[PDB]
Amino acid sequence: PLQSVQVFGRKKTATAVAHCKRGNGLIKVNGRPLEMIEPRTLQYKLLEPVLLLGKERFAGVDIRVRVKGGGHVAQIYAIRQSISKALVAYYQKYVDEASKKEIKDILIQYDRTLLVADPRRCESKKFGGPGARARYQKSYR
Amino acid sequence: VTVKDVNQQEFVRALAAFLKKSGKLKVPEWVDTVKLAKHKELAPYDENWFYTRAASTARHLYLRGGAGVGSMTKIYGGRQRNGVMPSHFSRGSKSVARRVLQALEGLKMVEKDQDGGRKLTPQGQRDLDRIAGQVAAAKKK
Amino acid sequence: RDISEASVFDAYVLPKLYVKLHYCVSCAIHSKVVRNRSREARKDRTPPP
Amino acid sequence: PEKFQHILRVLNTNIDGRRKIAFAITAIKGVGRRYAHVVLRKADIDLTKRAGELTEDEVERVITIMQNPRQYKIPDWFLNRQKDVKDGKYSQVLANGLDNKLREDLERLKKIRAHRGLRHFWGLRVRGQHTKTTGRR
Amino acid sequence: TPDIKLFGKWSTDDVQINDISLQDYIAVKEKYAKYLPHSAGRYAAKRFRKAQCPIVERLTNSMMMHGRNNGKKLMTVRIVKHAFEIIHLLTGENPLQVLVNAIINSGPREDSTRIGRAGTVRRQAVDVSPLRRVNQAIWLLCTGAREAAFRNIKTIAECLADELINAAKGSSNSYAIKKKDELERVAKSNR
Amino acid sequence: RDKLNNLVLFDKATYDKLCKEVPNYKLITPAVVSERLKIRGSLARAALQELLSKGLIKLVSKHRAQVIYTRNTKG
Amino acid sequence: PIKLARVTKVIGKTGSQGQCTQVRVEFMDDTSHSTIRNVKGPVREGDVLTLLESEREARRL
RNA sequence: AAUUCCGAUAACGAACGAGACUCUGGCAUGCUAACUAGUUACGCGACCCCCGAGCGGUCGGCGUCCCCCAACUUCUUAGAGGGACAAGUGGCGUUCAGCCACCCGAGAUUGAGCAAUAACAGGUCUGUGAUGCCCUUAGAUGUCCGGGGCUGCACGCGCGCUACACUGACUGGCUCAGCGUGUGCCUACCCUACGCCGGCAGGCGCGGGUAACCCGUUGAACCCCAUUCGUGAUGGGGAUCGGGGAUUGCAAUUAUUCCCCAUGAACGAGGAAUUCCCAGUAAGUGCGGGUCAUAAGCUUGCGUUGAUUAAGUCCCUGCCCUUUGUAC
RNA sequence: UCAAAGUUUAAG
């Protein structure tokens, strides 16, 4: 019997699903490790959970992630949420709950985004203007 | 180690050098004179560009197969300054993509697949994934 | 309290400045000594609290 | 490196040696960033150089290519005058010669009393753009 | 990295705030100073939520300005990092501390609120809020750095460094510090 | 007021100034070299690459828009 | 003398256009002292103002 | 937020509007679901070549070859349920209506749609085989055909796009979307994969698609990463104009559009004025839909990147109630 | 604890 956990992260329209498995802790996105992805200025983001919790917590859990939708930044924020969420879901099911709780606490005090997904989503444009809230310029005279 | 394990930028540099050293591609007559797409104000500053984009096509083919000429134009697309009007998409040059794909065909990097469009072949998988390994074993950086 | 603090005399009760003012209607109304009233509330000649 | 010209005199024009070569040539009437780059590639010059470098032989070599493009495989398109009425030639007109060719064409339309020449004569827009709202000079 | 959080390279600890007022509303450290100055950060939700956004993030945000740079954060993240690098080479010490000092001597102390006053506009002096002082400081010196970097060969990062240095030093030489003393002088002239 | 005219050359005195002085600065950027001297900008970049290759100035970062260089690395 | 002053009670928002919070302040050094004053910017109970003047005390404006 | 409530009371008991309501947004490892979703992780049954690590095993990576007698619904589509109520804790409030904070967690507030009475002599007879009267009615104001015009330029104003650069430009490279739409038609034709020919616009072949099937992992832009350029009206800007080449069309000259070479204007951030906007908003950034043979500097949608500042006030401009004065 | 602010087809 194998220890499989498939957990998702979201940001606007970026469904990043991280999939944890009893392994040796590779952690690769689509088909490549966390040292590319390639917005790159936001590398420490997709690293953050690993940096917070350390390699010791991950150690025995290999995580293959798949992403689609969103744009570059949104995808990073999705995977970052997802791999952390997946790790928490692994520890819930196939370790012990006090350990999970400790991980969850360590993540949240850094940032609540790591588990909780933003509801914020693109607002709809309405006629009489180029965007949602902005209007087209008034002539008057 | 595969090609996805390598930072794709410094990969295509190494593949281009590989394709120069081989010296059996089939760079056509134009190269010097041509624009490269209706996008562009200018032609490429790197005077042996054909080798570079040939490499880029090959690596694209490894990552995603079944890529026809039209598909190769779409990937090499961008902004088109209408100048005083606003910008739009424009597909890259067909003929250059087609010449690149025919050049790779002669090398036996690639082969035209069933159900249309190019895919790279085992003998091509050789070179691509060999140079990946070379880049990985360049230095720890 | 500042003056109490720096007074020579102990405790000291302060003084008071008394003025009988004389507003004419115009000047009373403008300075909001007197507002208008409704036709029925005009007749309440008790002072306010 | 190279301490020589800096400033250049080519085909009646004063080319800035100070500038980089592909963009330095374009100072001449009739050669644009396309054609200059093409011309330089047919010359086989290290175009990273400034125009203030380069041997006098090299600049003469460039000039000969620029003048006579089709003898060194500068193709048909890259030619500002293709199929040019006064003889059925196809070539790239440069310097004062370009401006002279233009004036002859305007003069030709004028002599014909065509529409396009008349508007040219009247100092109006020729390429049927709306003139109610723009170009108030 | 696990026990203490660097800012890529730089330290959060050993960054002492001088003025008890800028303190609290400068989030260089509560304890919480993250790796990057990019963040999801819905700090515009409520009124004072803004204050608990980190000052290096806030500086990035302010940098992302004047039409063509609107929304381009990563662009400006890089700018910030380079300015911090440049501050480290030029001045020494932690660039975050330099930035903090600059903020402290760049925000006003009192401004002149435009009251009506009959009809023709003559103002009275009033004493600015610490958050408002932090806000002004940030945008003043960011703007001063921006205005410097247009039509001469100098990167934004370099300018941004030079402004922060000449703010941290009471130089009367940065835009921001000079602008602040001009506001203060106006305030005194109607206090 | 501003009308800034720069050099594009190996013109002896400036090249000596580069070899002596530039390696003692803390900030060494193409921009900072151009404002110190009256050197183009491209010329400044090339000059800073030569000093890197020689081993007189130290690399900090080599990013698209801005490169940064340091003093020798003294002791 | 640049005196600091902690806010005890944010009173009410004055100013013509609505801007200057009228604020009641403890005077930090000797907490017996307690003035009122107007402030540009967003203020809240439990923060510190930097008052350059220390003797003016605004009321209605 | 509200003529929303509480409460007062020559009023009583009602009606509309507001609210409720409908759609949408976001929470559901809960349930029902699948070859026109994924497959999902397996099994790797493999193919497969050294594909790589590696002496070789075992692993890493995809492309896929996969059906069905593998296993399911995490992602997917969309059903019907649930889900937040101001319900909890603390204040404040006549300890009412309610307001403030904080816990749990979306915190009453996601954004639209619908929308009263009474008006206006608002617009529309050029949307109607809705229509009164008036006019005209064969040398027609009917109707159709050819041509022209609605595009004409001393000038004045309105919504727009492009810019004035180096937080940039160019040249490469890398790499992520979401609403849609689509032929085989109401009168003649769609979306288009793949292969060759053409620098390019484009041309010629064959295919798929009445569509979660094919286009289509819609491989978008900005962004990101290496380029050179160096504050010079410069490689910024791309107007004007000369020459050529394509397609649409019955026909394109007064340039239909598109491509190419050449030309290279003002513009170095805009006086007095004044517009719009508070959260995934503004702004940037592209792509759909509309019109459409040809086709957007408009529009109406869509996402992608993502600020500053507010959280208030009646100063201006207006609006709502109350009292008031009024020769309107 | 009071700056300036004048006028409005004949054409129904």
Side-chain angles (χ1 to χ4, degrees):
Chain A
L2 293 166
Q3 275 85 334
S4 59
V5 203
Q6 281 176 303
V7 181
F8 65 86
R10 289 166 163 284
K11 174 61 175 194
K12 301 170 174 173
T13 72
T15 49
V17 192
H19 161 57
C20 277
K21 157 159 264 70
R22 195 230 283 274
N24 284 328
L26 281 58
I27 312 156
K28 33 175 60 168
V29 180
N30 281 8
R32 35 184 90 159
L34 296 172
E35 312 324 310
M36 24 294 278
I37 293 72
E38 299 181 47
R40 196 173 258 122
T41 51
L42 279 44
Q43 187 184 302
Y44 269 97
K45 259 68 175 62
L46 51 80
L47 274 176
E48 260 156 26
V50 179
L51 307 177
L52 281 160
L53 305 171
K55 296 157 188 172
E56 296 284 288
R57 297 264 202 276
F58 281 73
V61 188
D62 189 355
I63 322 184
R64 268 89 148 204
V65 184
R66 66 208 167 286
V67 197
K68 57 243 177 73
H72 297 103
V73 169
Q75 285 198 340
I76 289 166
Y77 279 154
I79 63 172
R80 199 260 252 93
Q81 187 187 122
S82 86
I83 68 179
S84 99
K85 279 262 277 301
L87 195 80
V88 161
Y90 195 100
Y91 270 75
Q92 134 174 11
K93 208 145 53 164
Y94 313 126
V95 188
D96 84 82
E97 194 148 31
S99 190
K100 153 173 158 187
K101 188 203 172 186
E102 196 77 293
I103 287 165
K104 219 173 174 76
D105 292 355
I106 291 157
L107 291 190
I108 283 172
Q109 62 207 39
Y110 186 96
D111 201 317
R112 202 197 172 199
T113 306
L114 282 252
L115 314 159
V116 179
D118 283 56
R120 284 206 293 207
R121 226 150 253 35
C122 196
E123 200 161 62
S124 52
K125 147 158 152 52
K126 343 284 187 318
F127 60 85
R133 311 301 195 73
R135 266 50 274 293
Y136 294 124
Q137 194 197 357
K138 197 173 266 192
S139 59
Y140 246 86
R141 278 14 221 58
Chain B
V1 317
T2 189
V3 318
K4 292 174 174 280
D5 218 325
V6 173
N7 312 54
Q8 292 300 133
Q9 280 275 25
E10 77 213 47
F11 184 97
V12 302
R13 293 245 90 103
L15 187 47
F18 185 105
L19 291 157
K20 271 282 265 65
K21 288 282 282 186
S22 188
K24 45 179 164 189
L25 231 170
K26 288 288 291 181
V27 305
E29 187 142 307
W30 39 75
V31 183
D32 312 349
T33 187
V34 79
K35 186 110 94 73
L36 214 97
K38 68 184 213 94
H39 290 310
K40 315 268 88 189
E41 295 273 323
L42 272 48
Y45 292 130
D46 192 344
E47 302 229 299
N48 288 37
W49 62 257
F50 194 102
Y51 291 86
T52 303
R53 186 152 46 43
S56 182
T57 301
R59 99 69 170 62
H60 267 317
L61 281 151
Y62 178 80
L63 295 171
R64 335 86 129 250
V69 172
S71 220
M72 293 315 305
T73 57
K74 195 191 204 176
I75 179 58
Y76 301 147
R79 251 160 90 265
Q80 166 84 36
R81 243 133 321 306
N82 287 307
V84 81
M85 256 190 289
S87 54
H88 281 270
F89 193 100
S90 139
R91 292 178 148 249
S93 164
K94 296 192 192 80
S95 285
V96 301
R98 169 158 40 93
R99 256 55 163 73
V100 151
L101 288 158
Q102 287 177 230
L104 292 161
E105 236 277 312
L107 270 161
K108 307 192 179 174
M109 289 271 198
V110 308
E111 69 190 339
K112 64 221 278 174
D113 197 8
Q114 84 194 349
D115 315 339
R118 279 63 155 74
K119 70 169 178 189
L120 101 168
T121 213
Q123 191 181 124
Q125 253 207 120
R126 194 197 287 157
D127 300 3
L128 270 279
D129 217 319
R130 198 93 88 184
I131 65 161
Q134 277 165 30
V135 170
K139 248 170 182 176
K140 182 90 174 57
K141 59 192 291 297
Chain C
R1 87 89 214 242
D2 260 51
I3 287 153
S4 77
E5 274 169 359
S7 70
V8 178
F9 302 100
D10 187 60
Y12 202 70
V13 80
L14 278 162
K16 271 185 165 65
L17 195 165
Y18 305 126
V19 187
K20 190 145 187 263
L21 291 156
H22 293 290
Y23 278 68
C24 98
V25 162
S26 67
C27 284
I29 279 175
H30 176 50
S31 57
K32 303 161 185 183
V33 173
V34 304
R35 317 204 286 132
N36 80 67
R37 276 119 102 216
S38 53
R39 207 222 299 168
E40 311 94 293
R42 279 205 258 287
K43 304 179 199 176
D44 302 349
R45 77 203 274 88
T46 59
Chain D
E2 257 68 46
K3 270 47 67 81
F4 276 106
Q5 269 91 36
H6 297 79
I7 311 123
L8 248 164
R9 213 296 200 286
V10 166
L11 200 58
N12 269 232
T13 66
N14 295 317
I15 298 166
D16 270 23
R18 199 110 56 76
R19 286 179 152 284
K20 220 166 162 211
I21 303 148
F23 299 85
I25 298 153
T26 45
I28 294 152
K29 265 75 162 247
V31 43
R33 281 134 64 193
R34 277 313 313 183
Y35 181 41
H37 282 57
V38 169
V39 160
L40 289 202
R41 284 202 74 153
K42 301 311 192 175
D44 198 69
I45 303 160
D46 204 323
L47 66 60
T48 56
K49 278 196 165 202
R50 290 298 195 292
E53 308 183 51
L54 247 65
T55 63
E56 63 166 20
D57 291 15
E58 254 86 315
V59 321
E60 284 186 347
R61 151 72 87 71
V62 166
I63 290 156
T64 54
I65 294 162
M66 214 166 67
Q67 296 251 295
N68 279 12
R70 198 154 26 71
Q71 289 95 317
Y72 318 102
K73 296 97 165 256
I74 295 185
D76 321 47
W77 43 321
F78 286 111
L79 287 181
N80 86 279
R81 261 299 206 69
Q82 317 200 68
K83 196 183 292 192
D84 66 297
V85 193
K86 297 296 110 194
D87 302 47
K89 305 202 98 63
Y90 58 124
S91 53
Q92 192 131 35
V93 196
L94 280 153
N96 77 319
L98 167 57
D99 200 67
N100 210 40
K101 284 295 201 175
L102 167 59
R103 147 171 164 290
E104 287 177 317
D105 286 21
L106 309 209
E107 193 209 354
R108 193 174 62 22
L109 293 153
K110 209 90 64 45
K111 186 189 172 190
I112 294 155
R113 60 258 113 179
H115 185 68
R116 195 188 222 209
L118 284 184
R119 295 190 72 68
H120 264 22
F121 188 55
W122 302 342
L124 309 173
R125 289 299 156 69
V126 89
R127 295 169 191 220
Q129 42 260 122
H130 290 214
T131 9
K132 185 181 189 163
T133 52
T134 67
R136 312 228 177 120
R137 299 291 101 202
Chain E
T1 195
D3 279 28
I4 202 172
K5 275 127 77 183
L6 292 176
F7 186 73
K9 291 170 175 179
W10 317 125
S11 190
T12 300
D13 288 18
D14 285 27
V15 176
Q16 298 110 346
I17 287 70
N18 301 313
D19 200 330
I20 181 163
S21 53
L22 282 121
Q23 155 277 351
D24 202 48
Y25 303 162
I26 283 175
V28 73
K29 79 194 186 195
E30 274 83 306
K31 170 79 189 200
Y32 316 142
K34 293 131 177 92
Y35 288 109
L36 262 284
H38 190 247
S39 192
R42 41 166 156 192
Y43 302 130
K46 227 167 168 183
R47 175 163 191 212
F48 287 108
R49 209 84 76 91
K50 182 200 280 79
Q52 285 179 246
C53 178
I55 46 155
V56 190
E57 179 149 357
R58 286 172 55 66
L59 197 103
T60 355
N61 288 42
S62 286
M63 213 78 205
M64 189 170 49
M65 238 191 79
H66 255 44
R68 63 214 184 82
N69 304 110
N70 277 210
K72 272 176 220 173
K73 196 143 170 190
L74 311 192
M75 209 269 109
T76 234
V77 168
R78 207 81 215 110
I79 283 170
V80 142
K81 293 319 197 95
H82 283 21
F84 281 35
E85 277 294 317
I86 292 155
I87 290 153
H88 195 91
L89 296 175
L90 186 37
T91 311
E93 233 210 329
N94 281 349
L96 280 77
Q97 178 82 100
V98 163
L99 190 139
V100 158
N101 290 326
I103 297 264
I104 294 158
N105 19 296
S106 183
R109 304 173 191 281
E110 58 154 31
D111 253 312
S112 50
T113 194
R114 183 262 294 297
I115 199 169
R117 217 282 129 177
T120 302
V121 192
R122 294 282 176 250
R123 341 108 141 98
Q124 177 156 115
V126 297
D127 332 293
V128 281
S129 172
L131 174 47
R132 179 53 141 68
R133 286 178 328 85
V134 173
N135 295 355
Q136 276 258 40
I138 282 181
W139 95 251
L140 277 158
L141 68 78
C142 158
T143 281
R146 170 185 299 125
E147 209 154 296
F150 291 169
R151 316 209 238 295
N152 224 286
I153 314 110
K154 212 179 221 302
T155 49
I156 307 301
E158 216 104 57
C159 273
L160 202 259
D162 287 25
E163 207 91 6
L164 287 165
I165 291 158
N166 289 8
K169 181 197 284 182
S171 199
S172 309
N173 206 32
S174 156
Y175 175 88
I177 199 269
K178 190 149 199 173
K179 225 299 187 178
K180 174 258 194 172
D181 99 75
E182 216 95 284
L183 285 177
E184 211 147 65
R185 320 193 177 181
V186 153
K188 175 160 183 181
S189 194
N190 13 255
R191 69 150 86 250
Chain F
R1 199 192 83 141
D2 199 344
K3 183 140 281 175
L4 194 243
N5 305 28
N6 304 29
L7 303 156
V8 208
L9 204 59
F10 277 24
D11 57 311
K12 215 284 192 294
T14 55
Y15 189 47
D16 293 350
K17 278 166 198 171
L18 285 167
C19 292
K20 271 77 185 180
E21 289 170 42
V22 162
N24 306 316
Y25 289 81
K26 289 178 270 189
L27 269 42
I28 297 164
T29 75
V32 167
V33 164
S34 112
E35 80 174 308
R36 260 48 142 165
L37 308 184
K38 306 290 165 186
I39 208 86
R40 177 67 72 188
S42 56
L43 209 301
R45 278 192 269 95
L48 296 171
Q49 263 62 320
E50 290 167 39
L51 298 154
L52 250 187
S53 254
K54 190 162 183 180
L56 271 168
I57 61 176
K58 163 81 176 159
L59 216 184
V60 173
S61 58
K62 45 166 186 180
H63 183 280
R64 197 192 352 141
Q66 194 190 231
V67 309
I68 300 172
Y69 297 127
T70 345
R71 211 194 326 272
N72 286 65
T73 62
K74 88 301 177 64
Chain G
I2 299 162
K3 283 198 173 187
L4 303 179
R6 199 195 69 166
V7 172
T8 175
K9 185 179 187 178
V10 67
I11 304 163
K13 251 203 204 63
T14 62
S16 53
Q17 263 71 343
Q19 49 205 5
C20 294
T21 51
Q22 219 197 22
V23 194
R24 214 276 214 294
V25 294
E26 308 293 67
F27 228 141
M28 209 75 156
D29 301 301
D30 185 35
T31 195
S32 180
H33 276 291
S34 50
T35 56
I36 309 163
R37 42 235 324 286
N38 299 318
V39 172
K40 260 171 66 161
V43 185
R44 65 208 265 210
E45 279 183 346
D47 77 312
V48 196
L49 287 46
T50 311
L51 330 178
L52 316 190
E53 73 313 309
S54 100
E55 234 277 300
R56 277 47 166 86
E57 197 214 44
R59 299 189 92 182
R60 177 271 211 69
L61 90 175

